[PDB]
Amino acid sequence: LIYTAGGYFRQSLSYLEAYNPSDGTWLRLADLQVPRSGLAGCVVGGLLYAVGGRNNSPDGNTDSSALDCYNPMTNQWSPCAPMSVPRNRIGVGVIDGHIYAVGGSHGCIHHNSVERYEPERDEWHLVAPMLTRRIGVGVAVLNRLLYAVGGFDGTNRLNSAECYYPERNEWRMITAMNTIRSGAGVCVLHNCIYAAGGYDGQDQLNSVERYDVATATWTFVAPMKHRRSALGITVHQGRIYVLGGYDGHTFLDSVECYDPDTDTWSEVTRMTSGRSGVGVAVT
Template identity: 55%
Template sequence: MLCPRKKRLTKDADFSAFVVPSMRGSGYLDYTIESHPCRALQAMEEFRRHEMLCDITLHVTYKDTTTDFKVHKVVLASCSPYFKAMFTSSFKECHASEVTLRDVCPLVVERLIDFAYTSRITVGETCVMHLLLSSMRYQMEDVARACCDYLTKNLEPANVIGIARFAEEIGCTELHLKSREYINTHFNMVTKEEEFFSLTHCQLLELISQDSLKVLCESEVYKACTDWVRWDLESRAPYLHALLNALHVYALPPKFIKIQLQSCPILSKANSCRDFLSKIFQEMALRKPLPPVPHRGTQLIYVAGGYRQHSLSSMEAYDPRRNVWLKLASMDSPCSGLGSCVLFGLLYTVGGRNLSLQDNTESSSLCCYNPMTNKWSQNAPLNSPRNRVGVAVVDGSIYAVGGSQGPTHHDTVERYDPEANRWVFVRPMSVARLGAGVAGCGGCVYVAGGFDGQNRWNTMERYQPDSDTWHQLAPMSTVRSGLGMVCVDSYLYAVGGYDGLVQLSSVERYSVARDVWEPVASMRDRRSAHGVTTYQGRIFALGGFNSTGFLSGVESYCPNANQWTAVTNMLLGRSGMGVAVTMEPCPGNLPEDDEEEEVA
């Protein structure tokens, strides 16, 4: 009877081997000597150095010079399908004692031969391109991979376009893909380098047509195109219209388009391009229905701060495609009851408070998270601290609506101008509202529900920035505070909340065109103080609080099917967090020890 074939290491000063019971039967052991391959290679290398048992001479010709290398066919054939075919097939070289290799540098061939005998290759900046080209030519895959790895580790904005071209020309698919990924991820830096301006118009069109470009705002792509045209204005100006057509032009901020129409010198000389942008700007200004705009890069759902026994400073992002959570840079201080939004690709958190056993301080902070750098920064604070504030983005401005400071519940509203980095008060609401549902839609700010310290509201009002006026609209069917509100296809959805007695699972939607509320499918869980956002046409509800405690569950709603589906769980159950959607962070700026966590 044979015993299990379990490996056992036998080792002393001069002998090391893996020992297993032999398949020959009882009484036999199989020994695998660890050092044998290395010693065999060392012996072959010694034979080569002393020209012993060599059976082929390579004549390497390069620039009218010839260098000879005496080697062993079997060694070259063992690590190169090219030489294997040469020495084992019906080619005339099969029985030859001499072979000529033309138009390849002898120093490169010497390094390839050294690798064949030692398994070691030294790669550096001055030789990597020659090594890669020759290793591809002679099908020495391991050397090619080492060269690709070296180039990948040394990609920079100044060299990546050239490396991508080289990889494509020699058919090195992996390096080409890595280079394109780098260009997409670091687009804004790459477009400032001289290599970028050497692109042909076809190459630039191909680049900007990719949805995988990682940019905070489409204006970065527009600026790259106009800079490229300006580099050689006379010959490149005719290509501007084609470049504009390749842009996600409806993703350009209206204010940005207006500035370009007023001051861009290239547009002043290109009437067709000017007319094209002017037409789009007019459609935006008149609030006409616009075509859906595809997103650049992968979009994630971000969750900032929140409350669970105390305010939290952590931030995570959820990738619905892969069902994974990514831990990101924490906020500078713990915060719950904050509002959040995305403006020009940057994630902003507004107000809130730091609630713990030691502290209970309302915040007036405006914090900005840049997914390109995975860093937070501080912007101009609100004029008034606001806990449980509602936030909306309209026409490139952030609105902070209601909230509270101590016993005072706010009816005031502030607007933030990112260019001036300043908050100003606008006309106040008709009533004070804490924990109201707030959303931007069609150039207006909509506010529903909330709590004024005594009353919970079902009323809704709309703020029109152009006239600085509020208008009363049809009320919801249910009083709600701590609700979430989002806009999808000209409908406003009021999701969950608290009616003064219980947390709610009910959802109702408002038709902007008809000024009417109607019920839709309820959530699977009752929730208040939860996060609500939209992702690829679906509504996501995250966390919150109900009679069972703090919730970690995430569910999504499909408007077409009128159905909620359980999606995942957050890493930590919480309420009062900020939730918003923007591009995924750049991997190169994440700590190496940060791990993705998959949630069942």
């Protein structure tokens, strides 16, 4: 199922809801213990993780350094060790069963730092920083390499992307995207890195482009129906699913689905309530 955790509508949310693309059902599961938006989600060893974010509420606006783990067999959240700094609008990718936390903000500070979590030791350790400060950064893993794509450096929104080599622990810039995108959905489908939607400083985007490693080229594919930034994104059964977001006026419940073979986006479901800034993963 596609799990979405957290998000924002009027305040940061605790929701954990799981969608079944088979029967179209929405399952409601255990609440996050602390609300959070601008987090990221991943899955390691069959356990679902919620990383960073912040709790934006009527009584505070606290950036989160928290790492929290949901077991689909127990329906229970458990705390893990926290990151070295709070990271709102974080990006995460999974390499070799390790969780990489990328960028994000703490107050005015826009991080270029990166750190790596070892689930079997429940510890974080800092790795090499990105070349660019990036919040609202999209992160994807391809051929055991970590890509940081787009985002916002505190002043400029970014079309640049860079690549992390775990064996050499160093970052290398790659070809920039055709479009500047902060708060896009960034995943890997088959063997391209996809960047969908985002915000370019003036408008939310519906365009979608994909990166081909061998040619180092970004190409546009079919656009989504609805422009959106701060969306969740995941891959389910060779399909791309994007969930919610913000279009400059409204918080979307729309869930769109990209069929790569037809190069077509379809409306597949609505979330139970519109929201932005969710964390999403599959298990």
